Design a binder for this molecule. Structure first.
Ligand code: ZN
Length: 859
């Protein structure tokens, strides 16, 4: 039970102490032994200064036992030691020295010095993970980011093992089964950035050739042995080299640490870690299969994300953890800049927009949303106060800060900031000021608008044109931020005009204006007299964080010309804007489906190069068919859609994501005779779609589609169960059982689902998962009113954790009716648990929204 350091405790210790250097010795000789090994030898010698001689302080440590601890000559009383209390340090001198001999535990969790035995070759692999505060599990330290120091690490290793750390080292053979690894003293670092990576790791090497004031850099890659066959080292070294050439130009600071080693470590909890000069990666980035291009891009971004930290995080580190959002956010942004600037992934801002940004917007519109910047009063707070929104929205708003300051200014203040604060600590405000100095902007209000609030502002353009089509006036209307306080933020955004390219007839940008948008209305005089083209795009370049609307004329053009938009970022914004206008009843549902389907499989989404956007659009199109479309037009809608899914898939590249995407969409769609015919053929080899590999997942999905339409019965599911029985498989089979279209099958599920008292929680969700379908609306009418009637008693019956998914999942979002809305209010009358009402409220709103759009579609 390690200590929950508080912001105050850290501030007080930071006030009093200044740490100079750490000397660490570790006995890892017993490490290559078997599971009975539980401890290792950690001897820490720390030199530090105190500015109130005679005061009492404390140093952090988490160990099995403490052999001895000797402050300034005196042997200290370790009899009472507990990890939650560390080591009190009374009678401090002005200059102190502490030596501590202890025995630390290896771990099997993510934290501290983690230990793993490869079940295949029996070899033992060690790695460390110290963020936020696990450094104390290896050595004695003041474990808080603002007491930086240099480290001199020496390890005694089994002789088969390599030992990688922050700095480069030298090895001398001990000839007793071991080797001794002495690593250079490092430059100053925080405790959680210290690395130790020890084992029989496969090892490559390469070097980034030095240039432009940047010295050469020794690079290496490591991974377990078994995994070494699948390591594309060549590729990784090219992407590492692209990054090092980019970042020192951009930042104006050469790589601060000596070499750059990157290790792929087993059982890694956190994906990647930016230990200085020793970056760690989870094993999923070692591609063991023919792998999709999105995975390469994602991996490329991840490598770049950690490399960025060398400067921002490792060279200048925060003071306390409430700047953790800024640290990761900046890195996220820097790595998309690098990808676009120096890698093959020149479409990176598009990916960012459809993946991280879209996700941020989705989260930020729910009632769960919270601001980026949270108060972090103690260490435990970090884990609960910063979540995905923090990071997804953090990156997106830092991108807008870059736009507002201006990129060249921003990069210019980065240099001031890295030089001003290098090998030291720094706050948000320390960086806002550097940026004020570089650009003359006033950012005193910025955090209060963007980091401390929630919700999105809408931007709608207000325009007028003359007989010639040239703007006579152009204003941007900003709406209050919702959900939230309702403030109007300040944006730097661009506006782009798109017109036919005479040579190709494709929509290309013919004009671009940038401006500060402020308050509830902003004028755009740079557009007066400019021809309005065919498409007017506010928030072009996706520089700001908002909800955008298209004018009526641009909207009409889009329906018939979206695939002709030459660039992917503008084309992705319109896919986004069209869906948001469908959600809000400004784009008729039927007209969104027409946007999506296009004239041909070569127009609309059939033409979208971007896999992320295709997936989202396909998913959103289904949602528009099931809920926003009008019942009269809906039967046709589904046929048109499943018709197009089928052609799109029978046209896509063979192992392509796009081909897979069209299959998976067809799977969840409502099908006609041919669709079922072809799909049935795909599970069999009767008529395989070429290149379409059918794994269990896809096979199960295809069957779930077959079974859901009556084309496949219980027997068909049952045999697939013989083909595969797994924890995942039972669930997958259970979902199929629930989908069969018969009241008896549904009746079984409601009771089994709602009422399986003794059913595993895995299975409950899988029983509900298949309980709904776009095409069984008639088959579910009974459960509309009964869910409301029943839920009360299950809420009182089941636990908090179990009950909420059942209410959310079985909420009758399939019945979009005034009747069902009326029933929601009817249920709403009786007093019920606030948490139960909390769900019915979210749930009811979805039905209401769907009904207003159902209506606009009729309009
Ligand atoms: Zn990060």
């Amino acid at each position: 039970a390690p200590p929950n350091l508080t912001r105050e405790q850290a501030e007080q210790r930071a006030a009093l102490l200044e740490v100079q250097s750490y000397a660490i010795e570790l006995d890892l000789s017993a490490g290559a032994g078997g599971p009975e090994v539980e401890t290792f030898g950690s001897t820490t010698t720390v030199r530090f200064r105190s500015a109130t001689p005679g005061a009492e302080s404390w140093i952090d440590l988490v160990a099995a036992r403490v052999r001895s601890a000797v402050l300034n000559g005196v042997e200290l009383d370790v009899s009472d030691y507990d990890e939650s209390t560390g080591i009190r340090l009374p009678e401090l001198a002005a200059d102190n020295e502490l030596v501590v001999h202890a025995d630390c535990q290896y771990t099997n969790t993510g934290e501290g010095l983690h230990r793993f035995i490869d079940p295949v070759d029996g070899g033992v692999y060690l790695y460390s993970q110290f963020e936020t505060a696990d450094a104390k599990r290896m050595f004695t330290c003041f474990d808080q980011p603002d007491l930086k120091a240099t480290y001199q690490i020496t390890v005694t290793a089994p002789q088969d093992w390599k030992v990688i750390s922050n700095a480069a080292g030298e090895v001398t053979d001990t000839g007793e089964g071991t080797r001794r690894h002495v690593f250079d003293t490092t430059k100053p670092m925080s405790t959680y950035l210290v690395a130790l990576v020890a084992g029989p790791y496969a090892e490559w090497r390469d070097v980034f050739p030095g240039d432009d004031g940047q010295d050469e850099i020794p690079l290496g890659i490591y991974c377990r042995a078994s995994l070494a066959e699948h390591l594309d080292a060549e590729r990784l070294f090219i992407e590492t080299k692209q990054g090092f050439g980019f970042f020192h130009k951009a930042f104006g600071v050469p790589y601060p640490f000596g070499k750059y080693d990157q290790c792929f470590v087993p059982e890694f909890n956190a994906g990647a870690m930016e230990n200085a000069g020793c970056v760690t990666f989870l094993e999923d980035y070692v591609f063991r299969s023919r792998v999709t291009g999105y995975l390469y891009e994602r991996r490329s971004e991840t490598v770049l994300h950690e490399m960025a930290h060398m400067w921002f995080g490792d060279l200048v580190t925060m003071r306390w953890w409430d700047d953790l959002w800024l640290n990761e956010s900046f890195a996220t942004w820097a790595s998309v800049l690098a990808q676009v600037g120096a890698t093959q992934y020149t479409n990176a801002w598009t990916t960012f927009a459809s993946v991280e940004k879209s996700w941020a917007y989705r989260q930020d519109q729910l009632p769960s949303t919270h601001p980026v910047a949270a108060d972090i009063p103690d260490l435990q707070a970090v884990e609960v106060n910063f979540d995905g929104i923090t990071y997804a929205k953090g990156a997106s708003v830092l991108k807008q800060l870059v736009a507002y300051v201006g990129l060249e200014n921003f990069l210019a203040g980065l240099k001031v900031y890295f030089d001003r604060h290098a090998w030291g600590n720094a706050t948000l405000d320390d960086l806002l000021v550097a940026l004020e100095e570089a650009s003359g902007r006033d950012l005193s209000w910025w955090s209060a608008q963007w980091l401390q609030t929630t919700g999105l502002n809408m931007l709608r353009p207000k325009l007028a044109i003359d007989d010639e089509g040239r703007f006579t006036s152009f204003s941007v209307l900003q709406s209050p931020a919702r959900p939230g306080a309702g403030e109007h933020r300040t944006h730097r955004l661009a506006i782009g005009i798109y017109d036919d390219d005479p040579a190709t007839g494709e929509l290309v940008r013919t004009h671009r204006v940038e401006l500060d948008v402020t308050g509830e209305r902003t004028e755009v005089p740079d557009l007066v007299g400019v021809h309005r083209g065919k498409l007017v795009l506010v928030n072009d370049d996706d520089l700001t964080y908002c909800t955008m609307r298209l004018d009526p004329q641009s909207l009409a053009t889009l329906i018939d010309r979206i695939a002709d938009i030459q660039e992917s970022l503008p084309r992705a914004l319109c896919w986004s804007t069209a869906w948001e206008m469908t959600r809000e009843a400004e784009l008729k549902a039927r007209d969104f489906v027409s946007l999506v389907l296009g004239s041909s499989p070569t127009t609309g989404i059939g033409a979208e190069s971007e896999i992320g956007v295709v997936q989202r659009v396909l998913l959103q199109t289904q949602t528009a068919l099931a809920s926003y479309a009008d019942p009269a037009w809906q039967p046709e809608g589904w046929r048109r859609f499943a018709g197009r899914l089928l052609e799109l898939a029978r046209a896509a590249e063979p192992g392509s994501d796009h081909q897979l995407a069209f299959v998976n969409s067809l799977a969840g769609s409502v099908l006609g005779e041919e669709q079922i015919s072809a799909m049935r053929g795909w599970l069999d080899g009767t008529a395989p779609l070429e290149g379409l590999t059918v794994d269990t997942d896809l096979r199960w999905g295809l069957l779930q589609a077959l079974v859901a339409h009556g084309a496949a019965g219980e027997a068909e599911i049952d045999a697939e169960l013989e083909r595969d029985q797994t924890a995942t498989g039972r669930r997958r089979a259970e979902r199929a059982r629930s989908l069969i279209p018969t009241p008896e099958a549904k009746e079984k599920a409601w009771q089994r689902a709602v009422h399986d008292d003794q059913l595993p929680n895995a299975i409950s969700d899988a029983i509900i998962s298949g309980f709904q379908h776009p095409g069984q609306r008639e088959l579910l009418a009974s459960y509309v009113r009964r869910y409301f009637d029943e839920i009360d008693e299950v809420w009182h019956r089941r636990s908090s954790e179990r009950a909420q998914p059942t209410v959310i999942g079985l909420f009758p979002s399939w019945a979009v009716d005034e009747d069902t809305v009326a029933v929601a209010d009817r249920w709403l009358e009786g007093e019920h648990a606030p948490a139960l009402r909390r769900l019915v409220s979210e749930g009811r709103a979805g039905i209401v929204r769907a009904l207003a759009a159902r209506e606009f579609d009729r309009s």
